[PDB]
Write a protein that binds this ligand. Structure first.
Ligand SMILES: CCCCCCCCCCCCCCCCCC(=O)OC[C@H](COP(=O)([O-])OCC(O)COP(=O)([O-])OC[C@@H](COC(=O)CCCCCCCCCCCCCCCCC)OC(=O)CCCCCCCCCCCCCCCCC)OC(=O)CCCCCCCCCCCCCCCCC
Ligand SMILES: CCCCCCCCCCCCCCCCCC(=O)OC[C@H](COP(=O)([O-])OCC(O)COP(=O)([O-])OC[C@@H](COC(=O)CCCCCCCCCCCCCCCCC)OC(=O)CCCCCCCCCCCCCCCCC)OC(=O)CCCCCCCCCCCCCCCCC
Ligand SMILES: CCCCCCCCCCCCCCCCCC(=O)OC[C@H](COP(=O)([O-])OCC(O)COP(=O)([O-])OC[C@@H](COC(=O)CCCCCCCCCCCCCCCCC)OC(=O)CCCCCCCCCCCCCCCCC)OC(=O)CCCCCCCCCCCCCCCCC
Ligand SMILES: CCCCCCCCCCCCCCCCCC(=O)OC[C@H](COP(=O)([O-])OCC(O)COP(=O)([O-])OC[C@@H](COC(=O)CCCCCCCCCCCCCCCCC)OC(=O)CCCCCCCCCCCCCCCCC)OC(=O)CCCCCCCCCCCCCCCCC
Ligand code: HEA
Ligand code: HEA
Ligand SMILES: CCCCCCCC/C=C\CCCCCCCC(=O)OC[C@H](COP(=O)(O)OCCN)OC(=O)CCCCCCCCCCCCCCC
Ligand SMILES: CCCCCCCCCCCCCCCC(=O)O
Ligand SMILES: [Cu+2]
Ligand SMILES: [Cu+2]
Lengths: 552, 145, 139, 67, 75, 185
C-alpha cells in the first residue's frame, strides 16, 4: 500500500548531540571523520605558509619577509604537510572503511584507536606551538641535518617543541599500525579468505608493516638529538661519524615514509576504477604481488638521497631504485587494463582518479630520471627535485584523497555532494597545479637551488617565478568550492535511501545501509569472490562472470 | 518491478538492498528542497506543540473520497492519535480525517479552517504553500490532551 | 593462518638477503669499510619480521581451520559470541594530555614538569587498566 | 620587472579563471526534477508524509472541500 | 520559564533557558570592548590585527544567528 | 570462539617495533666505535666485570621465575601467580638497583654523558633499557593489583601471559647489550 516517510531528512541533530560523544567515543567511523576534519584544517594552514612563500619568491628582493621567517616558513610548511595531514589521513580512511570492507563489527582495540587520534592531535599542536616563541618556529630544513641542529647553531626553543611533537605523533602512528594489523588478522567475516579481501585492505596491511618498521628508528634518532641538545651528548659530533650517522638514520626512516603515504591511495584508486568502468579489476594477484614487491624494496634504497655526499656506495642503491621502478609500472598497466573495453562514465571520483593517473605518471618519470647518480650530481637540491616530489605527492595524496571523499561521502553521511561544484573544483585544481609546478623543472635545471629566500635580477628566472606564483594563487582559490560543497551538502543535499549510490559497486561496504548502523551490519551475503556486493545485487551475472574470467 | 527491480535483492533477513545508477537520485519529489524543508519543519513543530501526528497525502482519490481518506489514515504509525490531510489535484478535492483520541481537543473548529486556507492557496497553484498554511492553522488549533 | 605466516616469511627472506649482501659489499669496495648503520638497521628489520612470522607459524601449526580461512564456509558457521569490545571511555584523552605535559616538560627543560607528567601518565594508565575491573563500592 | 603588471596578473588571472569556469559549470542543469505545475495532471506516485515527532483505527471526524 | 523537553531532557528539573537577546547584546558589547581597547600606549600594530579580527568574527557570528532566527531556519 | 589470542598478536607486533627502536640505539653505538682507534674505551673508563655478571644472572633467574608464574596462571590458580610475580618483581628491582650503583661508581671516577663520546653512547644504550625495565615493573604491579579486585578469568590469564613475554623481550635485549658492551668491545 503506502509507507510513511518525512518530506526531508533531519538536517543537523539535537542540541548536545555531538560534544560529549566526541570526547568519549570509541566508534571507528566517528574517529575517521575526526581524522579527516582535523587533517584538512592542517592542510589549510600548510597551504597558507606556501602562499606566503610564493608571494615572497615573486619579485626579486625581500619585499615583506625576512631570511629567518622564510626559513621557518618552508620548514613548518614541509613538516605540517608531510606529518600532520597525509600520515593521519591514511589512518582516517582506514578507520572509515576497513572493518566494513572485511565484514567486521569493530576494530581490535577501540580505546587504543581513540588514544592514537588524541596523541596525533596534541603532538601536532605541541610541534606547531613554536611560532609564539620569541625565536620563532624551527628554521632548519624539514630533514634537520646533522650539525646545524645542535645547541650552538639554532639555539632557539622551536626545535625542541618540533622534536617532542614528532615523538608524540610517532607513538600515535605506531599504535595505529598495531591496531590495523591486528584487526586485519583477527576480525574477519566467516567467508572472507585473504585472497578475497579488497586491495585497499591489502595496501593498508602493507602500509602498517612499513610503519612499524620506519617510525621507531625516527623516535630513537629524535631522542639522541634531544640528548645532544639538552645534555651535550657528543652523539652527532662530526669528530665521530656523527654527520653521516644522522643522514643514514633519517633517510632509513624517511623513504619508507613516502611509500607509507602512497599505497593506501593506490588502493583507493584501484577500488574506484572498476565501479565506474563496470568491469573487474585487472590482475588481482598481480596487484597484490606488486604491492608486496614495492613494500620489500622500499627499505633498501634510502641512500639515493645521499648521492652528493661522496660517502655512499652508488651502484647498490642505484640498482635497487631502478628495480623498485618496475612494480609501479606493472600497477599502472593493471589500472589501464581495468578501464580497457568498458562503459566509462566520468563522475567526480573517476575524474579525480584520471587526474591522479596523469600527474603521477609524469612525477614517476621525473623520479626514475632522478635515480641516476651522474644526473643527480647536477639536478640535486634544486627546483627540479621540488617539482618531482610535488608531482608525485600531489597526484597521489591530493587527487586520491579528493576521489575518496567524493566516493565515500554517501556511505558515511547519507547525503550526496554536488557534482557541478565537484567538476569546478577538479578543473580549478588541475589547471592551478599544472600552472604552478611545471616551469620549476626548467627553473631548477638552470641554476636555482631550493630553499633560497631571495635572488638577483641579473640571474634568469624572474618570469617563471611569477608564473609559478600565479598558479599557486589559483591552487589557493581552488579550495573554496570544495569547502562550500561540503558545508552545504552535509545538511542539505540529495538524500540516499539505498545501498550503493554508485551502482555496480564491490567490496562489501556497498551491501549495508547508506549510513551504516552501530556494528555496521544487519546481515551478511555469501562470500565467493572479491565482488560480494556485485554478486549480491546482480545474481544473473555470476555465470557470465565466471565463464569469461580468463579471456583477456 | 514487484520482483526486486534490477538491483534490489532479498537478504538473509527481510531487508531489501537496492542500488542506483552512478548519476541518478533516489527520491524524485517534484518540489524544491527549501520548500520540502519548510514543510518538514512545520509538520514537526506543529505535531510537537499539539501532541498529535500530522500527515499529508497527495495521490488520487478515484472513489468515495471520504472512504479512501479514512482508509489511508490507517497507514499512519499511530492512527488513533493522528490528523491526515489528503489532496487530489486532478479531482481537486481536499479532505481532512481525524482519529478517536484526537477529538474534543479543538479538531472541529480547525479542519474547515485548514481546508479553507489550503483552497485559498491552491487557487493560484501553490501546492506546498497551501499544505504548509493548512498544517500551520490546524496545528495552532489543536491542543495537547 | 597460513597466508600471514607466508607473507612475513617472504619479507624475512628478502630482508636477510639484502642485509647480508649490503654487509659484504660494504666490507669491500667502500671508502671506510663496513657502514655499521644500514647493516644494523637491516639486520634488526630481519629480526622484526622473523619474530612476527615465527609467532604466526607456531600459532598456525596448532590450530584448526577457521571459517575465514576456508572457502565454502557458510555465514551460519561463524554464528556465536565474539569477544568484548569497549563502549564509551574518556581515559584515552587524559592519557594523551598527560603524555603531552611530560613532552612539553622535556622540550623546555623543566624537571618538575617532567615529574608531574610522569605521575599523571601513571595515574591515567592505571585508570585505563582498572576501568572494567573495579567492583561495587563497599560503603 | 613590471611591478604593476605582475601585481595585476597575480591578482586577476585566478579570479577571471574562476568566473569563467563557474559560468561554464554552475549554469548547467541539476538532476533535481522540475517543480510540479498544478495545471498538468499528477503523474508522480502517491506520497504520504508523517511527523515522526510523538514517539512511542476508529475514525473520529472529518471535513471536505473542493478548492 | 521553559524550553522543550525534546531539546533539553531535564528541562523540568532545573534552569534550562536563557533568552537570546542577552547573548546577542553581550556579543555586541564584547566586540565593542575589544575595539575600544585600541586606545592607550600600545605603539606597534601587531595587536590591532588580532583585536579587529576577533571583533569581526564575533559580529559575523551574532549576525548569522540573528538572520537565521529571523528567517525561520533555526528556532 | 577466539581460536587465536588477539592481545597476543598486538603485544608481539609492538615488541617487534620496540626491537626497531633498540636497532636505532645499537646503530648509534656501533658508529663512533670505528672512529676510536686503539684503546677505544677512553682515558678514565674501566668496566667492572665483577659486578656486571651478577645482575645478568639475576635477570635470567627472574625470567625463569616469570615463566613459572605463567605456568601457575595457565591453571586457574591465582595465588601461585601472585607469589611468582612478587619474586620476579623483587629480582627486577634488585637488577635496577645494581645498575644504578654501577652508574654512580662509574660517574664518580670519570665517564659522564657530556665528558666523552664513549660515555654518551654507553649511558644512552643502557639507560633506555633501564627505563624499559622500570616500565615492566610498573606493569607487574598493575597486573597484580588487577588480580586482587575481581574473579580470575581467561582475560586475566591472557594479561599475565603478555606481560610475561614482554619481560622475556626485555631480558633478551639485555643479553644482547651485555654481550656487545662487556665482551666483544
Ligand atoms: C569520506 C567521508 C568524508 C568525511 C568528511 C570530510 C571532511 C572535509 C573537510 C571539511 C571542510 C569544511 C567542514 C565544515 C563542516 C560543516 C558543519 C556541519 O554542518 O556538519 C554538522 C555535523 C552534524 O553534527 P551532529 O552531531 O549530527 O549535530 C550537532 C548538533 O546540532 C549540536 O551538537 P552539540 O550541541 O553536541 O555541539 C557540537 C558543537 C561542536 O563544538 C566543538 O566541536 C568544539 C570545538 C569547535 C571550535 C574550536 C575552535 C578552537 O558544535 C558547535 O559548537 C557549533 C559552533 C561551532 C563553531 C566552530 C567555529 C569554526 C571557525 O557535524 C558532524 O557530524 C561532524 C563530526 C566531526 C566534526 C568535529 C571534529 C572535531 C574533532 C576534535 C575537535 C577537538 C579539537 C581541539 C581544539 C579546539 C579547542 C576546544
Ligand atoms: C613506549 C610506548 C609504550 C606503549 C604501550 C604498550 C602498547 C602495547 C599494546 C599491545 C596490545 C594492545 C592491547 O592489548 O590494548 C589493551 C589496552 C587498550 O584497551 P582496549 O582497546 O579496550 O582493548 C581491550 C583488550 O581487549 C583487553 O585488554 P586487557 O584489559 O586484558 O589488558 C591487556 C594488557 C595490555 O597489554 C600490554 O600492553 C602488555 C605489555 C606491557 C607494556 C609495558 C611497556 C612499558 C613501556 C616502557 C617504558 C619506555 O593490560 C594489562 O594486563 C596490564 C598492562 C599495564 C600497562 C603498563 C604501561 C605503563 C607505562 C608507563 C611507563 C613509565 C615508567 C618509566 C618512567 O591498552 C593498554 O592496556 C595499554 C595502554 C598504554 C598506553 C600508551 C602509554 C603512553
Ligand atoms: C612532598 C611531600 C609533602 C606533602 C605530601 C602529601 C601527603 C599525601 C598523603 C595522603 C595519603 C594518600 C591516600 C589517599 C586516599 C587513600 C586511598 C585508599 O587507600 O583506598 C584505596 C581506594 C579504594 O577506594 P574505595 O572508596 O574503597 O572504592 C572506590 C571504588 O571502588 C572505585 O571505583 P571507581 O570507578 O570510582 O574508581 C575510582 C578511581 C580511584 O579512586 C580515586 O578516585 C583516586 C583519585 C582521588 C584524587 C582525585 C583528585 C583529582 C585528581 C586530579 O579509579 C581510578 O581512576 C584509578 C586511578 C588509580 C590511582 C593510582 C595512582 C597511584 C599514584 C598516585 C600519585 O582506591 C584508591 O583510590 C587508590 C589510591 C592510590 C593507592 C595508594 C597510594 C598512595 C601512597 C602514597 C605515595 C607516596
Ligand atoms: C536566505 C536563506 C538562507 C539559506 C540557509 C542556508 C544555511 C547556511 C547558509 C549561510 C551562509 C553563511 C556561511 C558562512 C560560514 C558559516 C559560519 C559557521 O560555520 O558557523 C557555524 C555553524 C553554526 O551552525 P548553526 O546553524 O548556527 O547552529 C544552530 C544554533 O546552534 C542554535 O542554537 P542558538 O543559536 O539558539 O544558541 C545561541 C548561541 C548562538 O551561537 C551559536 O548558536 C553557535 C556559535 C557559538 C560558538 C562560539 C560561542 C561564543 C564564543 C565567542 C569567542 C569568539 C572567538 O549563543 C550562545 O549560547 C553562545 C554562548 C554565548 C555566551 C553568552 C553568556 C551569557 C551570560 C551573560 C551574563 C552577563 C555577563 C556579562 C558578559 C558576557 C558577554 C556575552 O555551523 C557549524 O559549523 C557548527 C554546527 C554543527 C556542529 C558541527 C561541528 C563543527 C566543526 C567545526 C569545523
Ligand atoms: C609519494 C611521494 C613519493 C613517491 C611515490 C616517490 C617515488 C620515486 N622517487 Fe622520490 N622523493 C620524494 C617523494 C616521492 N618519491 C620526496 C618527498 C623527496 C625528497 C624529500 C626531500 O628531500 O625534501 C624525493 C626524492 C627522490 C630522490 C632524490 C632526489 C634528490 O634529493 O636529489 C630520488 C632519486 O633517487 C627519487 C626517486 C624516486 C623513484 C625512482 C620513485 C618511483 O617510485 C617512481 C616509479 C614511477 C614510475 C612511473 C615508473 C613505473 C614504470 C613504468 C611506467 C615503466 C617505464 C619504466 C621506466 C621509465 C624505465 N625520489
Ligand atoms: C603533501 C605535502 C605537500 C603539499 C600538499 C604541498 C603543497 C604546495 N606546496 Fe610544498 N613542499 C612540501 C610538501 C607539500 N607541499 C615539502 C615536503 C617541501 C620541502 C620541505 C623543505 O623545503 O624543507 C615543500 C616545499 C615547497 C616550496 C619550496 C620552498 C623552498 O624550498 O624555498 C614551494 C615553493 O614554490 C612549495 C609550494 C607549494 C604550493 C604552491 C602548494 C599547493 O599545493 C598548496 C596551495 C594550497 C592552499 C593555498 C591552501 C589554501 C589556503 C587558504 C585558502 C587560506 C585560508 C585558510 C585559513 C583561513 C586557515 N612547496
Ligand atoms: C634523553 C634520555 C637520556 C638518557 C636516559 C638514561 C639516563 C642515564 C643516567 C646517567 C646519568 C649520568 O651518569 O650522567 C652524568 C651527567 C654528568 O653531569 P656533570 O656535568 O658531571 O655534573 C653536573 C650535573 N648537571 O649528569 C647528567 O647529565 C644527569 C643525566 C640526566 C638524567 C636523564 C634525564 C631523564 C629524562 C627522561 C626523559 C623523559 C621524557 C618523556 C617525554 C616523552
Ligand atoms: C597558524 C600558525 C601559522 C601562521 C602563518 C605563519 C606565521 C608566521 C608569520 C608570517 C607573516 C610574517 C609577516 C611579518 C610582517 C612584520 O610586521
Ligand atoms: Cu627517496
Ligand atoms: Cu643535499
Amino acid at each position: 500500500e503506502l509507507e510513511a516517510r518525512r518530506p526531508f531528512p533531519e538536517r543537523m541533530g539535537p542540541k548536545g548531540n555531538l560534544i560529549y560523544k566526541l570526547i568519549t567515543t570509541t566508534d571507528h567511523k566517528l574517529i575517521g571523520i575526526m581524522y579527516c576534519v582535523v587533517c584538512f584544517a592542517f592542510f589549510l594552514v600548510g597551504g597558507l605558509m606556501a602562499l606566503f612563500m610564493r608571494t615572497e619568491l615573486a619579485m626579486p628582493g625581500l619585499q615583506f619577509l625576512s631570511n629567518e621567517q622564510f626559513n621557518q616558513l618552508f620548514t613548518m610548511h614541509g613538516t605540517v604537510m608531510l606529518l600532520f595531514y597525509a600520515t593521519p589521513i591514511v589512518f582516517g580512511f582506514a578507520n572509515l572503511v576497513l572493518p566494513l570492507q572485511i565484514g567486521a563489527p569493530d576494530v581490535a582495540f577501540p580505546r587504543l584507536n581513540a588514544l592514537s587520534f588524541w596523541l596525533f592531535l596534541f603532538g601536532a599542536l605541541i610541534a606547531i606551538a613554536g611560532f609564539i616563541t620569541p625565536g620563532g618556529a624551527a628554521d632548519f630544513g624539514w630533514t634537520a641535518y646533522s650539525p646545524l641542529t645542535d645547541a650552538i647553531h639554532s639555539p632557539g626553543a622551536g626545535g625542541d617543541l618540533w622534536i617532542m611533537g614528532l615523538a608524540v605523533g610517532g607513538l600515535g602512528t605506531i599504535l595505529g599500525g598495531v591496531n590495523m594489523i591486528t584487526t586485519v588478522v583477527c576480525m574477519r567475516a566467516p567467508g572472507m579468505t585473504m585472497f578475497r579481501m579488497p586491495i585497499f585492505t591489502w595496501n593498508i596491511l602493507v602500509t602498517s608493516i612499513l610503519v612499524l618498521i620506519a617510525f621507531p628508528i625516527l623516535t630513537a634518532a629524535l631522542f639522541g638529538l634531544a640528548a645532544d641538545r639538552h645534555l651535550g651528548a657528543h652523539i652527532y659530533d662530526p669528530a665521530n661519524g656523527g654527520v653521516l650517522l644522522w643522514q643514514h638514520l633519517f633517510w632509513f626512516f624517511g623513504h619508507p615514509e613516502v611509500y607509507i603515504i602512497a599505497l593506501p591511495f593506490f588502493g583507493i584508486v584501484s577500488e574506484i576504477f572498476p565501479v565506474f568502468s563496470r568491469k573487474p579489476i585487472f590482475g588481482y594477484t598481480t596487484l597484490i604481488y606488486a604491492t608486496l614487491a614495492i613494500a620489500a624494496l622500499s627499505v633498501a634504497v634510502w641512500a639515493h638521497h645521499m648521492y652528493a655526499t661522496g660517502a655512499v656506495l652508488l651502484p647498490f642503491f642505484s640498482f635497487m631504485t631502478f628495480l623498485i621502478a618496475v612494480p609501479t609500472g606493472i600497477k599502472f598497466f593493471n589500472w589501464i587494463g581495468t578501464m580497457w573495453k568498458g562503459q566509462l562514465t566520468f563522475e567526480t571520483p573517476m575524474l579525480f582518479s584520471v587526474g591522479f593517473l596523469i600527474t603521477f605518471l609524469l612525477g614517476g618519470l621525473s623520479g626514475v630520471l632522478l635515480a641516476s647518480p651522474p644526473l643527480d650530481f647536477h639536478v640535486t637540491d634544486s627546483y627540479f627535485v621540488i617539482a618531482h616530489f610535488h608531482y608525485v605527492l600531489f597526484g597521489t595524496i591530493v587527487f586520491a584523497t579528493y576521489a575518496g571523499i567524493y566516493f565515500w561521502f554517501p556511505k558515511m553521511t547519507g547525503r550526496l555532494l554536488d557534482e557541478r561544484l565537484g567538476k569546478l573544483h577538479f578543473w580549478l585544481t588541475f589547471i592551478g597545479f599544472h600552472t604552478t609546478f611545471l616551469v620549476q623543472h626548467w627553473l631548477g635545471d638552470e641554476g636555482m637551488p631550493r630553499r633560497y629566500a631571495d635572488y638577483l635580477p641579473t640571474d634568469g628566472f624572474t618570469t617563471l617565478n611569477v608564473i609559478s606564483t600565479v598558479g599557486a594563487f589559483i591552487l589557493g582559490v581552488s579550495m573554496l568550492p570544495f569547502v562550500w560543497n561540503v558545508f552545504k551538502s552535509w545538511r542539505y543535499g540529495e538524500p540516499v535511501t539505498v545501498d550503493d549510490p554508485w551502482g555496480y559497486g564491490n567490496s562489501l561496504e556497498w551491501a549495508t545501509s547508506c549510513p551504516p548502523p552501530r556494528h555496521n551490519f544487519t546481515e551478511l551475503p555469501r562470500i565467493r569472490s572479491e565482488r560480494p556486493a556485485f554478486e549480491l545485487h546482480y545474481p544473473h551475472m555470476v555465470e557470465r562472470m565466471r565463464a569469461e574470467a580468463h579471456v583477456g | 518491478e514487484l520482483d526486486l527491480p534490477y538491483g534490489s535483492a532479498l537478504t538473509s533477513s527481510g531487508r531489501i538492498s537496492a542500488v542506483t545508477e552512478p548519476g541518478e537520485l533516489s527520491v524524485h519529489y517534484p518540489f524544491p528542497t527549501m520548500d520540502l524543508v519548510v514543510l518538514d519543519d512545520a509538520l514537526k513543530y506543529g505535531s510537537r506543540a499539539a501532541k498529535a501526528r500530522f500527515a499529508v497525502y497527495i495521490g488520487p482519490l478515484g472513489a468515495d473520497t471520504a472512504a479512501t481518506a479514512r482508509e489511508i489514515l490507517a497507514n499512519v504509525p499511530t492512527p488513533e492519535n493522528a490528523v491526515l490531510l489528503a489532496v487530489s489535484p486532478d479531482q481537486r478535492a481536499i479532505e481532512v480525517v481525524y482519529g478517536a483520541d484526537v477529538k474534543g481537543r479543538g479538531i472541529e473548529s480547525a479542519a474547515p479552517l485548514g481546508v479553507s486556507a489550503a483552497a485559498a492557496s491552491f487557487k493560484e497553484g501553490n501546492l506546498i504553500d497551501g499544505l504548509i498554511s493548512a498544517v500551520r492553522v490546524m496545528s495552532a488549533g489543536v491542543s495537547p490532551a | 593462518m597460513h597466508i600471514e605466516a607466508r607473507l612475513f616469511e617472504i619479507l624475512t627472506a628478502f630482508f636477510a638477503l639484502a642485509a647480508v649482501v649490503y654487509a659484504v659489499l660494504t666490507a669491500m669496495f667502500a671508502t671506510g669499510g663496513v657502514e655499521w648503520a644500514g647493516t644494523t638497521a637491516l639486520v634488526l628489520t630481519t629480526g622484526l619480521t622473523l619474530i612476527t612470522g615465527t609467532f604466526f607459524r607456531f600459532v598456525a601449526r596448532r590450530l584448526d581451520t577457521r571459517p575465514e580461512d576456508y572457502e565454502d564456509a557458510e555465514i551460519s558457521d561463524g554464528a556465536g559470541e565474539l569477544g568484548f569490545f569497549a563502549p564509551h571511555s574518556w581515559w584515552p584523552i587524559l592519557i594523551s594530555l598527560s603524555f603531552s605535559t611530560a613532552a612539553v616538560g622535556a622540550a623546555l627543560w623543566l624537571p618538575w614538569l617532567i615529574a608531574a607528567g610522569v605521575a599523571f601518565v601513571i595515574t591515567s594508565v592505571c585508570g585505563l587498566v582498572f576501568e572494567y575491573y573495579w567492583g561495587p563500592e563497599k560503603h | 620587472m613590471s611591478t604593476a603588471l605582475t601585481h595585476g596578473l597575480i591578482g586577476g588571472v585566478p579570479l577571471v579563471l574562476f568566473a569563467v569556469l563557474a559560468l561554464i559549470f554552475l549554469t548547467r542543469k541539476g538532476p533535481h526534477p522540475d517543480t510540479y505545475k498544478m495545471s498538468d495532471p499528477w503523474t508522480h506516485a502517491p506520497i504520504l508524509w508523517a511527523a515522526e515527532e510523538p514517539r512511542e483505527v476508529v475514525i473520529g471526524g472529518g471535513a471536505s472541500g473542493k478548492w | 520559564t521553559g524550553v522543550d523537553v525534546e531539546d533539553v531532557p531535564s528541562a523540568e528539573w532545573g534552569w534550562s533557558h536563557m533568552p537570546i537577546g542577552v547573548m546577542h547584546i553581550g556579543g555586541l558589547l564584547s566586540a565593542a570592548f575589544l575595539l575600544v581597547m585600541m586606545r592607550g600606549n600600545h605603539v606597534g600594530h601587531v595587536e590591532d590585527w588580532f583585536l579587529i579580527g576577533f571583533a569581526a568574527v564575533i559580529v559575523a557570528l551574532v549576525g548569522r544567528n540573528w538572520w537565521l532566527r529571523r528567517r525561520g531556519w533555526i528556532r | 570462539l577466539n581460536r587465536p589470542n588477539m592481545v597476543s598478536v598486538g603485544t608481539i607486533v609492538w615488541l617487534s617495533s620496540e626491537l626497531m627502536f633498540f636497532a636505532g640505539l645499537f646503530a648509534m653505538y656501533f658508529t663512533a666505535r670505528a672512529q676510536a682507534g686503539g684503546a677505544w674505551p677512553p682515558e678514565p673508563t674501566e668496566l667492572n666485570l665483577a659486578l656486571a655478571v651478577p645482575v645478568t644472572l639475576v635477570l635470567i633467574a627472574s625470567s625463569f621465575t616469570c615463566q613459572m608464574g605463567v605456568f601457575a596462571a595457565e591453571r586457574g590458580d591465582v595465588f601461585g601467580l601472585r607469589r611468582w610475580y612478587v619474586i620476579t618483581f623483587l629480582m627486577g628491582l634488585f637488577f635496577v638497583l645494581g645498575q644504578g650503583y654501577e652508574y654512580i661508581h662509574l660517574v664518580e671516577h670519570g665517564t659522564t654523558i657530556p665528558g666523552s663520546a664513549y660515555g654518551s653512547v654507553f649511558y644512552l644504550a643502557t639507560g633506555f633499557h633501564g627505563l624499559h625495565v622500570i616500565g615492566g615493573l610498573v606493569a607487574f604491579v598493575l597486573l597484580l593489583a588487577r588480580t586482587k579486585m575481581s574473579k580470575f578469568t581467561p582475560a586475566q590469564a591472557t594479561a599475565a601471559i603478555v606481560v610475561s613475554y614482554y619481560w622475556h623481550f626485555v631480558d633478551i635485549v639485555w643479553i644482547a647489550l651485555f654481550a656487545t658492551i662487556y665482551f666483544v668491545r
